[PDB]
Amino acid sequence: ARVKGGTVTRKRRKKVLKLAKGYYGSKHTLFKSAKEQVMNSYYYAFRDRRQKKRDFRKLWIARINAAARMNGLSYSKLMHGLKLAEIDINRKMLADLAVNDAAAFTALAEQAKDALSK
Template identity: 35%
Template sequence: MVFLSIVNYVRARGPDEIWRKRRIFKLAAHYIGRRRNCYSVAVRNVHRALVYATKARKLKKEDMKELWDTRITSACEQHNITRFSLKEGLERANIALDRKSLSDLACWEPRTFECLAAVAKQKLELDGFVDGVDKKHPTGVNLNLKDVMLDAWLKERKN
């Protein structure tokens, strides 16, 4: 478009408006009715949806942390150790595993988690650590490091 005077140039909104509206309409493509076709309605609904999406990303992280903690706690109860004791024992044994890794082990590799719990318990006994933080008394099987070692498992498999 060629403008011979500055007045006509100022009044023309140009291609910027087309692309701005197109971006909003693209985000509103799955809506129904005027929410999809009318720009003034679509822009409100798209902005609201983007706000919800931003909040949901933070909530998803919190939900995952809660799920991982629940899995770790329930696996610890099976092996008669509290979650705090497990974390403290692994930390003292220089085993650095985060929540997600521990929960995956608890779900998909229970034998490995059992060995980690036994190592943590053994390390706490060697250090003379008394768990005074968690007042819960876990109900589960008492672990002994010798019971979950590879040699004992191999002997069991041969018999």
């Protein structure tokens, strides 16, 4: 009882080629080229889910430094001041305030300045 290899390989290969839409040239049209490229993209995406969380933290931190130097402080002294006062705002909300509500950011910077005035 013989088993022809009819329509299984074409389905698997067309599933692979559909993931390669938008690539350059023979990297979206030939199966071997696309196979290798798709493997590399899997590697890159796993790597970059972890690197994302670092990039936004550096972005927030630099915006907060910029805002605080306008209120007579630097980033490190203002973070210490907020900790000595028991304030628990993220660096995300801090930067969001720094860009949207400058008066709220100044209220907070004054609390920090009074905390480390002791």
